[PDB]
Amino acid sequence: EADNQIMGPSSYASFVVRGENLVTAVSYGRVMRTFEHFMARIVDSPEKAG
Amino acid sequence: KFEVLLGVYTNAIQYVRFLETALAVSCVNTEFKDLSRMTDGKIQFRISVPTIAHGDGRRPSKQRTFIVVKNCHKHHISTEMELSMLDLEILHSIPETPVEYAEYVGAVKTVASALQFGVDALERGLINTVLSVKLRHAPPMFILQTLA
Amino acid sequence: PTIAHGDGRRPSKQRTFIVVKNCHKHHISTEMELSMLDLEILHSIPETP
């Protein structure tokens, strides 16, 4: 089968500990992925379903 | 030094509709709002059979008729769901403070989820009750071919 | 989810599972030698060819 090629990503997806995650890391020693996402789902749109 | 919550994921359940499976190709679905009053259903057939006239002396059967009756069969489906008494109560109360609000939509989500589970598991019942009706009336192939 | 069963039998209640996966940590090491003489030469600026 004359394909021999696949489209892929050329760079890794990055994870960084920012100010929100960083504060938790210092104070409680626990870090959660996408604090942005958790806050968007808890504090901002609670009514909205998944 | 920390420990990281990498992800949280919830299984998502797709709805299953009887009128959208190809099993319904063998069925004719009519809705009946108040079927719960019907005592008995019935279908009556009348069929008249022709003959061939013959030169031979042998007696010929006269005009024939056939009348066949069929009857309805009822089916029943039941499901059970359980809910906490703490959960139904906070549905009524208005949320006073932000923690009492988050705990609140956590209750409406749960009650709603239970309801989805109840109505969904009713669609699986239609698909099964129909499929079981067939396999109850499907004679085996090795008997059927000769008889056709 | 479950199926509503026409057969007479006790129904099953709504259920959920909670399953936890956790990481594995991997460690990788390599060794590099830098000549003492080479480092000294690099530090200075060269004059003669």
In words, what does this structure look like?
Chain B: Belongs to the herpesviridae major capsid protein family. Chain B: It comes from Epstein-Barr virus (strain B95-8). This is part of a larger assembly, with three copies of chain A. Helices cover 38% and strands 6% of the residues of chain A. Chain A is built from two helices and one strand; from the N terminus they run αβα. Chain A has helices at 19-27, 35-44; one strand spanning 30-32. At the B-C interface, helix 2 of B face loops of C. Strand 1 of chain A pairs parallel with strand 1 (3-5) of chain B.
In short:
Chain B: Belongs to the herpesviridae major capsid protein family. Chain B: This is Major capsid protein. This is part of a larger assembly, with 3 copies of chain A. Helices cover 38% and strands 6% of the residues of chain A.
**What class, by secondary structure content of chain A?**
mainly alpha
- Series of H and E elements of chain A: HEH
Principal-axes shape call of chain A: elongated
Query: Which protein chains are joined by the largest interface, and how many residues does each one contribute?
Result: B-C, 21 and 11 residues
Helix content of chain A: 25-40%
Total beta-strand segments of chain A = 1
Oligomer: part of a larger assembly
Number of distinct helices of chain A? 2
Radius of gyration of chain A: 18 Å
Q: N-to-C terminal Cα separation of chain A, in Å?
A: 42 Å
Task: State the major sheet of chain A.
Answer: none
β-strand percent of chain A reads: 5-15%
Protein name (chain A): Major capsid protein
Family (chain A): Belongs to the herpesviridae major capsid protein family.
Subcellular location (chain A): Virion; Host nucleus
Organism (chain A): Epstein-Barr virus (strain B95-8)
